[PDB]
RNA sequence: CAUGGUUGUCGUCAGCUCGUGUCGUGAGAUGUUGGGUUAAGUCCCGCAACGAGCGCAACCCUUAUUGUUAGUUGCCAUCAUU
């Protein structure tokens, strides 16, 4: 990836000076107009490392979970994960999604079962009220679990956009010892993430850029 | 004031809990809280919670209109008689 690509995407922007994290000074270039500037040179080195790391994971057939509920990142992570054939969570991370994976499988089973009933034809013999409710049930399960409906096992790697926003997701990864590759901003904590990617969390183009690079790494590994 | 069974009572009030997960050294907590909404823990939304159970509601009886099958021991409009 190119430094010009990053600059055009606006990756270099950070959050306000006051809201930074001191641990991020390792990756900060300078502060302009009261906002910190990520060092895009370190960004290039680190994005290359993460691309290689994601490639290594894919070469083992490992499962990748693309997580982001930021308004900017939700749609982008969905598309890239689908394109890479890996699973995504873009709306809201349910507590216990992984640590309570056993319980979640029952909601996934509910979602699969309700889909079959429609195709099966049970919906035709349903007394209106029932079919209405069942549709509503599905709409929510798809809304929450839809992106990981078919995930076979706990992910081997978790990609996270704005871990500070995705607080619960980072915690579950730590509990299960799942390495994390995250778009880290000036206000985030790098110590939590195995693979640090210094990049603005608040730029749609930047989020899509980095997510596409990770998705492409996975595809290439496969 | 050894008990089973039966019953009163708060009160037909909307509550009482459990599984898994998570938080807390621990008793415990979370969910069951919050914004709305409802008669309702009723429902929606949000939420480290996701579900479930006993409740709530519904399924039940009766009452309020009516189609149809039946037409006596019931009914009498159409008819004639008492
Ligand atoms: K519990
Ligand atoms: Mg209570
Ligand atoms: Mg209830
Ligand atoms: Mg809630
Ligand atoms: Mg009842």
UniProtKB/Swiss-Prot annotation:
InterPro entries assigned: Ribosomal_uS2 (IPR001865), Ribosomal_uS2_bac/mit/plastid (IPR005706), Ribosomal_uS2_CS (IPR018130), Ribosomal_uS2_flav_dom_sf (IPR023591)
Pfam families from the UniProt entry: Ribosomal_S2
A GO biological process held by the record: translation
Superkingdom in the source lineage: Bacteria
Cellular component GO terms, alphabetical: cytosolic small ribosomal subunit
One annotated GO molecular function: structural constituent of ribosome
Official protein name in the record: Small ribosomal subunit protein uS2
Protein family according to the UniProt entry: Belongs to the universal ribosomal protein uS2 family.
Originating species: Enterococcus faecalis (strain ATCC 700802 / V583)
Source organism phylogeny: Bacteria, Bacillati, Bacillota, Bacilli, Lactobacillales
Gene for this chain: rpsB
Alphabetized UniProt keyword annotations: Ribonucleoprotein, Ribosomal protein
């Amino acid at each position: 990836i190119s430094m010009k690509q990053l600059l055009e995407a606006g990756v270099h922007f950070g959050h306000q000076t006051r809201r930074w994290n001191p641990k991020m000074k390792k990756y900060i270039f300078t502060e302009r107009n009261g906002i910190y500037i990520i060092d895009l040179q370190k960004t290039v080195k680190l994005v290359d490392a993460a691309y290689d790391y994601m490639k290594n994971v894919a070469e083992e057939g490992g499962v990748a979970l693309f997580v982001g509920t930021k308004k900017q990142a939700q749609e982008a992570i969905k598309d890239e994960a689908i394109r890479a054939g890996q699973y995504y969570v873009n709306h809201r991370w349910l507590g216990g999604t992984l640590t309570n994976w056993d319980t979640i499988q029952k909601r996934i089973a509910r979602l699969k079962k309700i889909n079959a009933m429609e195709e099966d034809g049970t919906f035709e013999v349903l007394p209106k009220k029932e079919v209405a409710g069942l549709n509503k049930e599905r709409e929510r399960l798809e809304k929450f679990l839809g992106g990981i409906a078919d995930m076979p096992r706990i992910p081997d790697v978790m990609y996270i956009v704005d871990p500070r926003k995705e607080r619960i997701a980072v915690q579950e990864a730590h509990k299960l010892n799942i390495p994390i590759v995250a778009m880290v901003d000036t206000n985030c904590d790098p110590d939590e993430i195995d693979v640090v990617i210094p990049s603005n969390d608040d730029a749609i183009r930047a989020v899509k850029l980095i997510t596409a690079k990770m998705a492409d790494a996975f595809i290439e590994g496969n």
